[PDB]
Amino acid sequence: EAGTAFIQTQQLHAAMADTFLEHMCRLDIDSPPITARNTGIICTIGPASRSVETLKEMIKSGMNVARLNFSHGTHEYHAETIKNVRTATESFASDPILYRPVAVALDTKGPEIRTGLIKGSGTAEVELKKGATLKITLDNAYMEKCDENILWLDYKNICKVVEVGSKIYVDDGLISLQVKQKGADFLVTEVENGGSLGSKKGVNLPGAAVDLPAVSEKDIQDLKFGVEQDVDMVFASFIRKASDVHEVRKVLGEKGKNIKIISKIENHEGVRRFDEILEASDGIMVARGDLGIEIPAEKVFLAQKMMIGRCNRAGKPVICATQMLESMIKKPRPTRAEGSDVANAVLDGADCIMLSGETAKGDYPLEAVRMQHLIAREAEAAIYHLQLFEELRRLAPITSDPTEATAVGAVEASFKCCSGAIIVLTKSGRYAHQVARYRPRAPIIAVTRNPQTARQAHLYRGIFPVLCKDPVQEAWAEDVDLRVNFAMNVGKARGFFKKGDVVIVLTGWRPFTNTMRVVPVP
């Protein structure tokens, strides 16, 4: 009864524009997005978020992956976090229609450089003043006696790799020092950018060839623990070259062979060697915290868009990480730059976006999760699928693989009929991954009986995993019908589609494979 003033939902007017410029001109704050949200949300768990009750609310707010940061905390601490994540996750298991799989990710310490404890209790801070002198020492007598005159750090070969004139950054790159004099086991520096220095802060040596192992002996101990704890994926810090990825993967052994290996790119060499790292990895994290200290801050966006582009081209998951909503550690709503950053990461093509301090330590963890969910959904509607889908195909090789032809045909069909979902029956995840790489607008409901598949599927844009708990039916067609009906019930319950809407169904392995059907929702 309103009239022609009706506004197309999910930016459909912008979607039909013949140019990218006119696409932008048509973006409409009054065009509401669809219910489905395709970008995975990864949350770092810490003191602010590790209670079972908070974790339940984080799952409800949209958390898909729990990130454990092994730069901090002992093994018992992480074991208890994992236990709590699973308690919270399985509290929803009585209703398989609404249960959300939640993945567990181990983020390695890796070749970090860290300072010591400020003298006193270690909880105090000292003020470093611009122009003052600061001695860096390796003598362990000072490892708990750091102050404004002497700073201990844990990198035993630092004096070899730096030179007079080199810059040293401390604490998220906020403190900067210039090396004035070198010593046998010390450096004499002058404070350039001063500030308040606390304990055990990260140190970066841009332009220095740091020779710490990609995976140290202690890192291996963490990875072994991760296999014991049945984690789903490893985020490997400071990956510099393909062989670093192999050091992570091979040490997990046969028992850990299905754990996904995500290489974190956070230094100049990792960017330079990106193609060989990507080839060896299951996926990539754009780890912008260290990256933006190791290279100039003004170049990070180039590295981010390069890596997201190349991961999209290869069909491998890419995560955009660090400081996306940083002010929400202390404030209940984000800055305008932060809202923009999350939206542009999704428009760039990131499969997942991440929260670190915002959920690990901050005062508003749920609000931060909720805001990533809201922004992601708005940005997903704004993607110019007409160009993106055309380019993904053209940059995708002709192969004789029938399963790739099925996947692109399914996504093509999904665009042609504006389907409410692509339902995919998958054991390993592969069939759903193949669909996700062509970036449909519609959500991909991936039905699996494999619990690890259901958890790992969150690495891909658009894959909404659902874990089927029913016994296998002896008749294959009846087993397919059961799993398809499950996905139909999930989509109706979640508001992705309604009775009578059109969806695409990919029925997975048949004892041809992965038949496609385009059907109305029953």
Among all residues, which ones are annotated catalytic? 67, 114, 264, 322
* 21 lies in the site for a copy of itself, by CB under 8 A: yes
| Torsion sign over Cα 283, 464, 501, 2 | negative
3-state secondary structure (DSSP) of residue 465: strand
**Residue 58: φ, ψ to 5°:** -65, -40
CA angle 476, 479, 485 (to 5 degrees): 140
Q: Is 514 helix (H, G, I), strand (E, B) or coil?
A: coil
Asked whether 167 and 187 are in contact (CB, 8 A), the reply is: no
CB of 299 to a copy of itself, least distance (A): 4
The smaller minimum CB distance to Mg ion, of residues 67 and 100, is found at 67
Residue span binding Mg ion (CB under 5 A) among the ranges 19-27, 51-59, 287-295, 439-447: 287-295
Cβ 289 to ligand OXL, closest distance in Å? 3
Does residue 372 sit in helix, strand or coil?
helix
Chain contacts with ligand OXL (rule: CB under 6 A):
237, 264, 266, 287-290, 321-322
Residue of 55, 107, 245, 271 that binds K ion (CB under 5 A): 107
Is the CB of residue 434 less than 8 Å from the CB of residue 401?
no
Residue 27, contacted partner among ligand OXL, K ion, a copy of itself, none, CB below 5-8 A by kind: a copy of itself
- Which of ligand OXL, Mg ion, a copy of itself, none has residue 22 at its interface (CB below 5 to 8 Å by kind)? a copy of itself
Stretch that binds Mg ion, among 142-150, 251-259, 266-274, 380-388 (CB under 5 A): 266-274
CB of 122 to Mg ion, least distance (A): 22
| CA-to-CA dists, residue 326 to 331, 339, 371, angstroms | 9, 10, 12
Tell me the per-residue interface mask from 62 to 101 with K ion, x by CB under 5 A, - otherwise. Answer: -------x-x------------------------------
Name the one range near a copy of itself by CB under 8 A: 113-121, 166-174, 247-255, 441-449: 166-174
Closest CA to 152 of 217, 193, 201, 213: 201
Site for a copy of itself in 236-295 (CB under 8 A): 268, 271-272, 288-289, 292, 295
CA angle, 239 then 245 then 251, to 5°? 125
**Closer residue to K ion in complex, CB, 50/437:** 50
Q: Give the span between the Cα atoms of 187 and 150, in whole angstroms.
A: 10
Look at residues 290, 288, 282, 258 and name the one whose alpha carbon lies nearest to residue 110. 290
Q: CB of residue 321 vs a copy of itself: minimum separation in angstroms?
A: 9
Nearer to ligand OXL, 288 or 441 (CB): 288
Tokens at 126, concatenated: 């000292």
Of 187-195, 265-273, 403-411, 462-470: span binding Mg ion (CB under 5 A): 265-273
Q: How far is the CB of 111 from ligand OXL (least distance, A)?
A: 12
Candidates 426, 498, 438; CA nearest to 466 is: 426
- For the bound state, the minimum distance from the C-beta of residue 238 to ligand OXL, rounded and expressed in Å, comes to 8
Residue 207's binding partner among ligand OXL, K ion, a copy of itself, none (Cβ under 5 to 8 angstroms by kind) is none
> Residue 350 or residue 502: which is nearer to Mg ion going by CB?
350
Residues within window 312-371 making contact with a copy of itself, judged by CB under 8 A: 312-313, 322-327, 331-345, 348-349, 371
Q: Which of residues 475-514 bind a copy of itself (CB under 8 A)?
A: none
Q: Which residues contact 136 (CB under 8 A, 6 or more apart)?
A: 150, 151, 152, 153, 158, 168, 177, 186, 187, 188, 189
* C-beta atoms surrounding 492 within 10 Å: 17
Task: Report how many residues bind K ion under the rule CB under 5 A.
Answer: 4
Residue with smaller CB distance to ligand OXL, 288 or 377: 288
Residues between 184 and 243 with contacts to K ion, criterion CB under 5 A? 237
* Nearest residue to Mg ion on Cβ basis: 290
- Binding partner of residue 476 among ligand OXL, a copy of itself, Mg ion, none, CB cut-off 5 to 8 Å per kind: none
Q: What are the residues facing 448 on neighbouring strands?
A: 467
Q: Which does 483 bind (CB under 5 to 8 A by kind): K ion, a copy of itself, ligand OXL, none?
A: none
Tokens 């799993």 correspond to 483
Residue 122's region, left for phi above 0, alpha for psi from -120 to 50, else beta, is left
Cα distance between residue 186 and residue 150, in whole Å: 10
**CB of 112 vs ligand OXL, minimal distance in Å:** 9
Q: Which two tokens stand for residue 419?
A: 């389907």
User: Toward Mg ion, which CB reaches closer, 48 or 291?
Assistant: 291
**Pick 84 or 322: Cβ nearer ligand OXL:** 322
| Alpha-carbon gap, residue 16 to 23, rounded angstroms | 8
Q: Pick one of 222, 244, 247, 266: the residue that binds Mg ion (CB under 5 A).
A: 266
* Cβ proximity to ligand OXL, 34 vs 320, nearer residue: 320
Q: List the beta strands (DSSP E) in 194-237.
A: 195-197, 202-204, 233-236
Among residues 322 and 453, whose Cβ is nearest to ligand OXL?
A: 322
Give which of 228, 233, 248 is closest to 64, Cα–Cα.
233
Specify the residue, 292 or 491, whose C-beta has the smaller distance to ligand OXL. 292
Instruction: Find all residues with CB under 8 Å of 333, minimum gap 6, and list them.
Output: 367, 371
Of the candidate spans 34-42, 222-230, 290-298, 503-511, the one that interacts with Mg ion by CB under 5 A turns out to be: 290-298
Q: CA 30, CA 42: separation in Å to the nearest integer? A: 29
Q: Which residues bind Mg ion (CB under 5 A)?
A: 266, 287, 289-290
Q: Which residues bind K ion (CB under 5 A)?
A: 69, 71, 107, 237
